[PDB]
Design a protein around this ligand. Structure first.
Ligand SMILES: *[C@@H]1O[C@H](CO)[C@@H](O)[C@H](O)[C@H]1NC(C)=O
Ligand SMILES: *[C@@H]1O[C@H](CO)[C@@H](O)[C@H](O)[C@H]1NC(C)=O
Ligand SMILES: *[C@@H]1O[C@H](CO)[C@@H](O)[C@H](O)[C@H]1NC(C)=O
Lengths: 22, 48, 90, 97, 63
């Protein structure tokens, strides 16, 4: 699976490490 | 140089004088009340 | 010219705003301005010196107020999103 | 025999995922669609929208307020339409997701 | 004599630097694989008169 004009991306609440733990 | 020239060309033979490489003072032109019409059909008559 | 500080600039009428730093990218001799995939004015060359100035937008980001119920307590904790707070106090 | 078959099947799934380039098609398409929508939203900033220029600072300078208001109004209408279109498409895509 | 301009004849449209950017420009370009006129100067041989038509791609090889 593969600068700012008022645009911000919010990180997900569950990181990939914790999703992998789930 | 072109504003105070003693002669001006006719409309059918209008000139095209290029001004470049100089500092242009539009403040005196805007504040000069000698002009009867100073309206601008371009962008603005003061912010230049 | 002031660098590494959020200062407004008007490069012969550009009237932009951002942070001007040293630019590692190499502008070609004829090229003057710079853009990106979003055609944002990323870099500008000086009008008196042959120096390339990288430009980054001034830090912005919405704030959030993490607060418990007001019936519980009035204390809050503010989150300045997507900014390092070595520059938050402003 | 069942254990051997299951192990071989797991290995074959690993190999197929490694080999097939469009295996992660759904996730790749979702990411590409979001990136494309964001890119077109940003590209809408440079559109003229009928004003004298697409640069808000250019409009603000070299312009008196009485017509700078109408130029800014045209820019507002265009950019608000673009943002509303993007938000509606994002709502549709979020419903699909 | 006619010769084919294979791919030469591309110029920078403006003065903007771009890195890994596939930009689309609409301007006066020399078409790829467009036949251009060959001319001679040795041996006698002279240089003729040609029009402009808003754009000329000159290319002279000399020693
Ligand atoms: C806040 O807490 C008090 C004390 O438990 C309670 O009576 C009140 O209903 C709470 N407020 C809300 C909005 O739940
Ligand atoms: C702020 O944090 C970011 C995290 O990515 C780091 O890269 C950056 O260097 C930090 N800023 C300073 C001034 O140390
Ligand atoms: C070059 O291309 C033109 C335009 O299609 C054509 O008329 C001409 O015959 C071509 N010349 C040769 C030598 O094939």
């Amino acid at each position: 699976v593969t600068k700012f004009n008022g645009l911000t991306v919010l990180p997900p609440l569950l990181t990939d490490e914790m999703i992998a733990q789930y | 140089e072109v504003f105070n020239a003693t002669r001006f060309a006719s409309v059918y033979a209008w000139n095209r004088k290029r001004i470049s490489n100089c500092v242009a003072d539009y403040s005196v032109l805007y504040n000069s009340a000698s002009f009867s019409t100073f309206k601008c059909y371009g962008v603005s008559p003061t912010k230049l | 010219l002031v660098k590494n500080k959020c200062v407004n600039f008007n490069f012969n009428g550009l009237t932009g705003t951002g942070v001007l730093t040293e630019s590692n990218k190499k502008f070609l001799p004829f090229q003057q301005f710079g853009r990106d995939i979003a055609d944002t004015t990323d870099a500008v060359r000086d009008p008196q010196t042959l120096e390339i100035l990288d430009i980054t937008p001034c830090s912005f980001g919405g704030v959030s107020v993490i607060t418990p119920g007001t019936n519980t307590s009035n204390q809050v904790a503010v989150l300045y999103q997507d900014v390092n707070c070595t520059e938050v106090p402003v | 025999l069942i254990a051997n078959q299951f192990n071989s099947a797991i290995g074959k799934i690993q190999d197929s995922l490694s080999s097939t380039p469009s295996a992660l098609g759904k996730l790749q398409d979702v990411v590409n669609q979001n990136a494309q929508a964001l890119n077109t939203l940003v590209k809408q900033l440079s559109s003229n929208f009928g004003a004298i220029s697409s640069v808000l600072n250019d409009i603000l300078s070299r312009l008196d307020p009485p017509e700078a208001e109408v130029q800014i109004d045209r820019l507002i209408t265009g950019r608000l339409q673009s943002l509303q279109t993007y938000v509606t498409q994002q709502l549709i895509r979020a419903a699909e997701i | 004599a006619y010769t084919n301009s294979f791919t030469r004849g591309v110029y920078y449209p403006d003065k903007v630097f771009r890195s890994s950017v596939l930009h689309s420009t609409q301007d006066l370009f020399l078409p790829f694989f467009s036949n251009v006129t060959w001319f001679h100067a040795i041996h006698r041989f002279d240089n003729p008169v040609l029009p402009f038509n808003d754009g000329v791609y000159f290319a002279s090889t000399e020693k």
